């Protein structure tokens, strides 16, 4: 299960839940895709802290939103990684991306 609450203008939480599959992950590709294109969403806080697991399309989900985003030099912010998540995305450099802490004091980071 996942979430995509709009907290603040344009910033999105895609809080995770459980288990993220292929359909899911294709659901949030596409509409979080067209909200940056539209401008809607500049800033993604991607919130790992209550994921089981997730297809591995998912990898490809979140690198492909900030390849959008730093089109329009948009915001991701990797929130409370698993072990598995915060390795695959260690792996890709990203560890600059990632951070540990509540959700409100990643939000509050990007007012």
Same mark, same amino acid.
């Given at each position: ?6 907290? %603040?203008?344009? %910033? ?13 992950? =294709? ?11 539209? &401008?809607?969403?500049? %800033?993604?806080?991607? #919130?790992? =802290? ?7 399309? $998912?990898?490809?989900?979140?690198? $492909?939103?900030?390849?959008?985003? =730093?089109?329009?030099? $948009?915001? %991701?912010?990797?929130? #409370? ?11 890709? &450099? ?18």
């Amino acid at each position: 299960a996942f979430q995509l609450e709009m907290v %603040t203008r344009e %910033t999105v939480v895609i809080r995770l839940f459980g288990e993220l599959d292929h359909h899911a992950v =294709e659901q949030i590709r596409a509409k979080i895709s067209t909200a940056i294109f539209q &401008g809607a969403v500049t %800033t993604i806080i991607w #919130n790992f =802290e209550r994921l089981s697991f997730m297809d591995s399309s $998912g990898v490809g989900l979140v690198l $492909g939103r900030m390849r959008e985003l =730093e089109a329009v030099a $948009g915001r %991701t912010i990797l929130l #409370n990684p698993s072990p598995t998540m915060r390795k695959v995305f260690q792996f890709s &450099g990203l560890g600059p991306w990632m951070m540990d802490a509540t959700e409100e004091e990643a939000i509050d980071r990007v007012r």
